[PDB]
Design a protein around this ligand. Sequence first.
Ligand SMILES: NC(=O)c1cc(-c2ccc(CN3CCOCC3)cc2)c(C(F)(F)F)[nH]c1=O
Length: 428
Amino acid sequence: NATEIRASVGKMIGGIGRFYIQMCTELKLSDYEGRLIQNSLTIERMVLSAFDERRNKYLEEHPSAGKDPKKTGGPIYRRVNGKWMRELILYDKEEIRRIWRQANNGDDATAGLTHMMIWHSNLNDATYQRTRALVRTGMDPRMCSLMQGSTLPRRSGAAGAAVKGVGTMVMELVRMIKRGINDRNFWRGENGRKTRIAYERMCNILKGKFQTAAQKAMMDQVRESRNPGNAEFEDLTFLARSALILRGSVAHKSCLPACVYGPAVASGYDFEREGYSLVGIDPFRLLQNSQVYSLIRPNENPAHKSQLVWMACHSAAFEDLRVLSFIKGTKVLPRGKLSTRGVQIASNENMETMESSTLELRSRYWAIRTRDMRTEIIRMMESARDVSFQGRGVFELSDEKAASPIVPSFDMSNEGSYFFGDNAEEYD
Ligand SMILES: NC(=O)c1cc(-c2ccc(CN3CCOCC3)cc2)c(C(F)(F)F)[nH]c1=O
């Protein structure tokens, strides 16, 4: 059945590629402009915005975009006489939807919208810090390493649920508990009945992420509370801290930008026939046969901007840096050592100083990713407790059948956390 599962994922990637090729053709973008990641993000947000209809399911937007709910837009960058120009494009949401369905042979293809949303989340995880929002909710700033998918939309649903991390679930459940404390009727009536289902859904989602019997049992007690007060917060926090040692089951999906699938489809690659799997060589091979460009700000180091995108492409912001340095072949520095700022350009930035760089997104090897008395038990379980790769090893790109595993070497002395010494901008 894994052949039938590979065909369905391949169909979805091909439609994203076909949708991008169409959008580039409407906008009259060049090969360079089409391969600019800033343009890709604009094009990807436009389709999410057109299909969202302000539901906060695939995206969240500024009230300025709410001026005309029937139109969606964003910034487009074109290269005019060596310089870079920024223009705002406004398309009809109906026409964007029409183009998406046409690219997906009449199908709604919600699987492709989610993939771009998950790539967008992975990019924010690789770019912005969340330590101020942790302090705001009353959580430990050290919980940074468990904030997978913390930027995902308000009503992301089942698709966003799989990639959200332990600390992300704890942050939204604690934002929920704190709303009850300051509002008397938060758990009352029809609003409180809807709120109650949302609470138990979030609790069962977080419960499923725990791989021990005691952590899952502790979640049942937080979920059984009809009026969660400070007692439910102390238990959520004490469980969040335990995840920083006793690991959880968090899914990481390598979702590449549409300007990667675009050119791959444009050159005749049949994703539906050939198949596609986010696990293994498929995203690694596609990145070796790709050419992505990015706008670079003055005084920014292009190698560091390339690293931001390579980690976002690979869902690697929360992985051990000693593992990534072995796979990429180059040293993967903590965010605190990168002379770079996020790929998205701000509405007030000077375009005259803006230059561009070729992103270096290839890697040396490829690899497979595989993903009270109760408080006394989990506390004792942490005392059992070094770089860990679980797996046969790494492989070269020529070995596509994984028949020749390479055993990895890491300096356990060298940094393992991307968030150590973090000086990245705070998300907002
Ligand atoms: N799609 C993929 O197979 C893919 C996988 C991996 C990846 C991440 C981590 C590990 C090490 N351990 C972690 C625990 O689980 C067992 C494997 C191996 C491979 C990466 C990246 F992070 F290295 F960048 N990127 C990708 O694209």
